[PDB]
């Protein structure tokens, strides 16, 4: 999972702290990316711990 404010961090070859210390795609990737909003993940006004 990512922050979701930008989804263009999972792609073959760009740099950013979301996907420079966590996940890195090779330059010969032959796969697929699917992404969608998460709504019912958690529900409290003050936020989780």
């Amino acid at each position: 999972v990512i922050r979701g404010n930008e989804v263009s961090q999972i792609a073959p070859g760009q740099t950013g702290n979301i996907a420079d210390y966590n996940y890195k795609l090779p330059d010969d990737f032959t796969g697929c990316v699917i992404a969608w909003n998460s709504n019912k993940l958690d529900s409290k006004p003050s936020g989780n711990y």
Partner: protein, 50 residues
């Protein structure tokens, strides 16, 4: 979600597809066809068409 426009996280289910060079072990819902030789026959040998 009290704040919005991208504030919610994105679920990412990236799949990695490896080209074969090996036994396949998953292909697709096509079943079989009886083998025949010495004739002009369309091919679907392990995915690539000919």
């Amino acid at each position: 979600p009290t704040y919005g426009v991208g504030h919610q996280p994105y679920r990412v289910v990236v799949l990695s597809f490896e080209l074969l060079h090996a036994p396949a072990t998953v292909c697709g819902p096509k079943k079989s066809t009886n083998l025949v030789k010495n004739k002009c026959v369309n091919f679907n040998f392990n995915g690539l068409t000919g």
